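Colleagues,

Please find the record for the two-part complex below.
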Amino acid sequence: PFDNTTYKNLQHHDYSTYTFLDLNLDLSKFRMPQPSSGRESPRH
Amino acid sequence: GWASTADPLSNLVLTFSTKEDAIAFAEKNGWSYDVEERKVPKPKSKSYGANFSWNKRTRVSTK
Protein backbone atom coordinates (compact mmCIF):
# COMPACT_ATOMS: atom_id res chain seq x y z
CA PRO A 1 0.00 0.00 0.00
CA PHE A 2 1.42 3.35 -1.11
CA ASP A 3 1.46 5.87 1.74
CA ASN A 4 2.87 9.41 1.50
CA THR A 5 1.64 10.60 4.91
CA THR A 6 3.95 8.97 7.49
CA TYR A 7 7.59 9.55 8.39
CA LYS A 8 9.67 6.39 7.94
CA ASN A 9 12.92 7.73 9.47
CA LEU A 10 12.08 6.73 13.03
CA GLN A 11 15.14 4.61 13.88
CA HIS A 12 17.20 7.58 15.10
CA HIS A 13 14.93 7.83 18.16
CA ASP A 14 16.57 4.61 19.41
CA TYR A 15 20.25 5.39 18.76
CA SER A 16 22.65 5.37 21.71
CA THR A 17 25.97 7.14 22.26
CA TYR A 18 28.04 4.15 21.09
CA THR A 19 25.90 3.27 18.05
CA PHE A 20 28.39 4.65 15.51
CA LEU A 21 31.39 2.95 17.13
CA ASP A 22 29.66 -0.43 17.45
CA LEU A 23 28.56 -0.12 13.82
CA ASN A 24 32.18 0.55 12.83
CA LEU A 25 33.33 -2.41 14.94
CA ASP A 26 30.82 -4.67 13.18
CA LEU A 27 31.89 -3.27 9.80
CA SER A 28 35.58 -3.91 10.55
CA LYS A 29 35.27 -7.59 9.59
CA PHE A 30 34.08 -6.80 6.04
CA ARG A 31 36.90 -4.41 5.10
CA MET A 32 39.73 -5.10 2.66
CA PRO A 33 43.37 -5.00 3.85
CA GLN A 34 44.86 -1.51 4.04
CA PRO A 35 47.97 -0.43 2.10
CA SER A 36 51.25 0.18 3.88
CA SER A 37 53.67 3.09 3.55
CA GLY A 38 56.65 0.88 4.42
CA ARG A 39 57.31 2.39 7.85
CA GLU A 40 55.63 2.46 11.24
CA SER A 41 55.46 6.26 11.37
CA PRO A 42 56.95 9.32 9.64
CA ARG A 43 58.99 9.79 12.84
CA HIS A 44 60.40 6.25 12.51
CA GLY B 1 84.39 54.79 33.85
CA TRP B 2 84.35 55.66 30.15
CA ALA B 3 86.12 53.68 27.42
CA SER B 4 89.48 55.32 26.76
CA THR B 5 91.76 54.22 23.93
CA ALA B 6 95.15 55.02 22.43
CA ASP B 7 94.57 53.50 18.97
CA PRO B 8 93.71 56.05 16.24
CA LEU B 9 92.68 53.48 13.61
CA SER B 10 90.00 51.87 15.80
CA ASN B 11 86.99 53.33 13.95
CA LEU B 12 88.48 53.04 10.45
CA VAL B 13 86.32 50.92 8.13
CA LEU B 14 86.88 51.11 4.37
CA THR B 15 84.43 49.98 1.68
CA PHE B 16 85.57 48.36 -1.57
CA SER B 17 83.54 47.03 -4.47
CA THR B 18 85.72 43.96 -5.16
CA LYS B 19 88.44 42.03 -3.36
CA GLU B 20 91.22 43.14 -5.73
CA ASP B 21 90.60 46.84 -5.06
CA ALA B 22 90.96 46.21 -1.32
CA ILE B 23 94.13 44.16 -1.91
CA ALA B 24 95.62 46.92 -4.09
CA PHE B 25 94.73 49.58 -1.51
CA ALA B 26 96.30 47.52 1.29
CA GLU B 27 99.50 46.89 -0.69
CA LYS B 28 99.73 50.54 -1.78
CA ASN B 29 99.56 51.81 1.81
CA GLY B 30 102.03 49.18 3.03
CA TRP B 31 99.67 47.46 5.48
CA SER B 32 100.24 43.78 6.17
CA TYR B 33 96.89 42.19 5.43
CA ASP B 34 94.88 38.99 5.49
CA VAL B 35 91.88 38.26 3.26
CA GLU B 36 89.11 35.69 3.69
CA GLU B 37 86.97 34.48 0.81
CA ARG B 38 83.30 35.33 0.41
CA LYS B 39 80.81 32.77 1.76
CA VAL B 40 77.64 32.59 -0.33
CA PRO B 41 74.72 30.31 0.65
CA LYS B 42 74.43 27.14 -1.38
CA PRO B 43 71.19 26.86 -3.41
CA LYS B 44 68.63 24.80 -1.52
CA SER B 45 65.85 22.60 -2.91
CA LYS B 46 62.45 23.69 -1.57
CA SER B 47 59.18 21.86 -2.16
CA TYR B 48 55.87 22.54 -0.43
CA GLY B 49 54.56 19.07 -1.30
CA ALA B 50 57.36 17.41 0.68
CA ASN B 51 55.49 18.38 3.86
CA PHE B 52 52.76 15.92 2.80
CA SER B 53 54.81 12.92 1.68
CA TRP B 54 53.43 9.38 1.53
CA ASN B 55 56.43 7.36 2.74
CA LYS B 56 59.24 9.85 3.49
CA ARG B 57 60.36 11.17 6.87
CA THR B 58 59.85 14.79 5.74
CA ARG B 59 56.18 14.75 6.78
CA VAL B 60 55.31 17.60 9.12
CA SER B 61 53.70 16.63 12.41
CA THR B 62 51.64 19.84 12.32
CA LYS B 63 51.03 22.85 10.11
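The two ends of chain B are 52 Å apart (CA to CA).

Comments are welcome before we finalize the supplementary table.
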